[PDB]
């Protein structure tokens, strides 16, 4: 069931069936995907990133651990991704605003999660739109997972380089996340301060579905809201 690829094993686990590696893949997914967005939308300079490959034919730019400021951001995502281990992370989103830091956003890259009770078949709750569809999505093996990753990244690159208009010369981008209902009230992610507001969207804004992720015991759905569309 595992993946037969050395290039893939450089970034992601070859196995994604058991609960721990399913969570591990999501951790790496968050890191890889959101790194690509930060570069492709030019929110950080090229220096923060290092060149990596998902497959031999596909390259991506991942936050380099040798840059101290990029390493700090990489740990934001690592910490966020860790909340997927125990099913406490509902949504993590890259939120772009005019001023730091408004509730209403300009551009949002959202990754929403769904967890599974046992065996990776039944949705868990953990919650209370695409929730319905994403819950019905079934694990189809690691090869399906690799395709999902490749698809998402090709789509992010394409969306940012050939669909979206370049961001304004002045903005502020930060990561905003939402905890699940299962999460303890004492539960906070290191680097993410409390807040009474998440993010809001202007009524006329346009959304496009970037892709999905379905490992053994997790499910992710990634979208994009931007005036740049």
């Amino acid at each position: 069931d595992a993946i037969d690829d050395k290039t893939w094993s450089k970034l992601f686990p070859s196995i994604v069936s058991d609960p721990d590696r399913s969570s591990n893949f999501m951790i790496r997914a968050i890191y890889v995907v959101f790194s690509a967005v930060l570069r492709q939308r030019n929110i950080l300079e090229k220096e923060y990133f290092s060149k990596n490959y998902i497959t031999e034919n596909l390259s991506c730019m991942t936050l380099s651990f040798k840059n101290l400021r990029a390493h700090q951001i990489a740990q934001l995502l690592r910490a966020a991704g860790d909340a997927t281990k125990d099913g406490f992370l509902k949504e993590i989103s890259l939120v772009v605003t005019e001023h730091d830091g408004d509730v209403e956003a300009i551009e949002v890259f959202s990754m929403k999660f769904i967890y599974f009770e046992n065996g990776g078949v039944v949705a868990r709750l953990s919650t209370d739109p695409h929730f319905a569809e994403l819950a019905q999505l079934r694990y189809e093996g690691a090869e399906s997972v690799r395709d999902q990753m490749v698809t998402i990244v090709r789509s992010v690159q394409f969306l940012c380089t050939k669909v979206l208009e370049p961001l304004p010369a002045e903005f502020t981008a930060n990561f905003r996340l939402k905890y699940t209902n299962d999460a303890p009230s004492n539960f906070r992610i290191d680097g993410f301060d409390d807040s009474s507001t998440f993010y809001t969207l202007p009524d006329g804004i346009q959304s496009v579905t970037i892709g999905h992720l379905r490992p053994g015991h997790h499910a992710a759905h990634m979208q994009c809201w931007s005036k740049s569309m």
Binding site: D100, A173, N174, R176, F192
Partner: peptide, 17 residues
Amino acid sequence: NARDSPYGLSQGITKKN
């Protein structure tokens, strides 16, 4: 300590021009 909301915000990344 109890948490008021299910939200968490990170440090921003700004650009001025």
